[PDB]
Nucleic acid binder design. Structure first.
Ligand SMILES: [K+]
Ligand SMILES: [Mg+2]
Ligand SMILES: [Mg+2]
Length: 135
RNA sequence: ACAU
DNA sequence: CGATGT
């Protein structure tokens, strides 16, 4: 119904899908960029959406912040809830980096606690998520 | 179908 | 138009 402005918003950006993947997190109210991941040579949109949420969880936990996280990705929200990223991306030499990060993100979820609400950004009602890459 |  | 996902 109402945007929770006191929140962190995350999004992926890519060149190709699968392709080069990056992600970032922003203050929903101001758009200030709070973190940005260096581009990963090959990944999928959903792997990047997933890593962005988990990075957000770790970022907020380290800062003792109880703000929620917004993502526009139905898929990534579910993967985080399940602590399991059910990607179809082949595991080979060229995808090793993204899969290492995904494996490590699952491992973090399996060894840490958090109460952060992970909320669906309602693009149809509110426009593009504030972390969007505009592409 | 819906979400990207 | 193509791909990633539930
Ligand atoms: K974009
Ligand atoms: Mg997105
Ligand atoms: Mg976007």
């Amino acid at each position: 119904e109402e945007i929770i402005w006191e929140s962190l918003s995350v999004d992926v950006g890519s060149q190709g899908n699968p392709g080069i993947v990056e992600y970032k997190g922003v203050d929903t109210k101001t758009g200030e960029v709070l973190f940005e991941r260096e581009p990963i040579p090959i990944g999928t949109n959903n792997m990047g959406e997933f890593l962005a949420i988990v990075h957000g969880l770790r970022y907020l936990k380290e800062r003792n912040s109880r703000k929620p996280i917004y993502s526009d990705s139905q898929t990534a929200i579910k993967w985080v809830k399940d602590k399991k990223a059910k990607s179809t991306l082949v595991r080979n030499e060229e995808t090793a980096l993204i899969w290492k990060l995904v494996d490590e993100a699952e491992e973090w979820l399996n060894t840490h606690t958090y109460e952060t609400p992970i909320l669906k950004w309602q693009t149809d009602k509110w426009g593009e998520i504030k972390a969007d890459y505009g592409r």
